[PDB]
Design a protein around this nucleic acid. Structure first.
Length: 156
DNA sequence: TGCAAAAAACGCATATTCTCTATGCAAAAAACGCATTAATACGAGAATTTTGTAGCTACTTATACAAAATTCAGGAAAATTTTTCTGTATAATGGGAGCTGTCACGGATGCA
């Protein structure tokens, strides 16, 4: 089921000479045909045209459900670790408190704008006992509450 | 039983330092390519050859007369049982069985 035999023999299943698997998938006639000769038995259905000529017998067009769906997951990964940020491109959630959400740092908004202008942002609540809970985990993606709490997370 | 108060502990001055987060090493997997050999399949040849079709032939049977060799329904004897008829010889000489305690009605006779 693995990638090379998956993607190789299947898109084979609509073409061969395994020269078709070597292309698109990558597995050459070497590790494809040899491993697929024994694999032709492991899911339990003849995929290509057993050394014949042109066929779609029981390839992977009907095996990808229990097959491709998986490696489509890492196919999204095969694309890239995202485009902006590796994980959760939008990750800038500010604290909800009654002190300083509004007005003390407009040159920081300047630099954020200078490095990246009008960039969408988000928010969470913390508490300050609950800020503690969710910052020693680091929930509050950006977090500000009396430093006398929330102590754990990474880097001590 | 109110504190003023002392010494040692318990809180603001750093060494240590040691789990700790942090990149380059290295060793063997793996998988990709050079590729080689063999095997899976295309080409030709004429060989078997079964099936498909015709006429002949042998088996199988359609049928037309009827007394086959056997079944049966009366017909007329017996056979024994049973039925009807006829006969048996002293004298014998008038028949029992409840009704008698119902109330009331409607004729129908008898009886002076």
């Amino acid at each position: 089921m693995r990638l090379e035999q998956l993607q190789a023999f299947l898109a084979i299943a609509e073409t061969g000479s395994f020269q078709k698997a070597a292309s698109k998938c990558g597995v050459t006639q070497s590790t494809i045909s040899r491993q697929i000769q024994s694999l032709e038995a492991d899911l339990g259905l003849e995929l290509f045209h057993r050394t014949n000529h042109s066929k779609l017998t029981l390839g992977g067009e009907r095996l990808l459900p229990r097959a491709r769906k998986i490696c489509l997951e890492w196919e999204t990964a095969t694309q890239e670790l995202g485009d902006l940020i590796a994980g959760k491109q939008p990750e800038l959630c500010i604290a909800a408190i009654h002190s300083l959400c509004g007005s003390y740092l407009p040159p920081v908004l300047q630099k954020f704008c200078r490095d990246y202008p009008e960039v969408q942002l988000r928010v969470t609540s913390l508490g300050s006992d609950r800020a503690l809970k969710v910052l020693k985990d680091g929930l509050v993606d950006l977090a500000i509450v009396m430093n006398n709490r929330f102590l754990t997370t990474g880097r001590d």
